[PDB]
């Protein structure tokens, strides 16, 4: 239940990453496809999901609400399989869409890093990593609920 970044594992294989905040687990929909998750001897049940945002939350509604300011560098807190968590600082590019601009990070880490949080200078999660496009360099949207 503790706040922090978590590996999402399966039986072991790391399939993604998520953020625990205010007792709610946040990850990307394509990581879990909405399945229940084990946390020690407890079960986390899906609570809200949206395939178009590629997001899912467990045990409560989506809690993460910071957003990129459009100017500053951010940090991807990548949790690659078999490696310790590491911070990668970058300046986001931009996904320009019909419904506005979305920040995007041109960082390409293993697929089990999907769901790793992107942080602003204040340490707040502004989105999750792992849904994006190939320009083959991958560019991930900064996906925020």
């Amino acid at each position: 239940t503790t706040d922090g970044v978590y590996r999402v594992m399966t039986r072991s294989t790391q399939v993604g990453v998520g953020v625990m905040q205010e007792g709610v687990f946040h990850t990307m929909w394509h990581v879990t496809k909405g399945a229940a998750l084990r946390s020690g001897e407890g079960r986390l049940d899906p609570y809200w999901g949206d395939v178009k945002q590629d997001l899912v939350s467990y045990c409560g509604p989506w809690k993460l609400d910071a957003a990129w300011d459009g100017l500053s560098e951010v940090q991807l807190l990548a949790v690659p399989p078999g490696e310790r968590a590491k911070n990668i600082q970058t300046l986001p590019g931009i996904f320009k869409t019909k419904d506005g601009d979305i920040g995007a990070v041109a960082l390409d880490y293993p697929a089990g890093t999907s769901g790793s949080p992107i942080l602003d200078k204040s340490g707040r999660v502004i989105g999750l990593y792992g849904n994006g496009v190939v320009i083959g360099s991958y560019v991930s949207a900064i996906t925020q609920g």
Partner: protein, 37 residues
């Protein structure tokens, strides 16, 4: 499927890398981004 804690959510005084491309994209109902010309 299970979860394991891997770290704090903290900014770290961190390697610096990566471009900042500006791309035109569309997002479909399946949550798939695609490039637009």
């Amino acid at each position: 499927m299970y979860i394991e804690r891997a770290g704090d959510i903290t900014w770290e005084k961190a390697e610096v890398t990566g471009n900042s491309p500006r791309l035109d994209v569309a997002l479909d109902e399946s949550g798939d981004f695609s490039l637009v010309e």
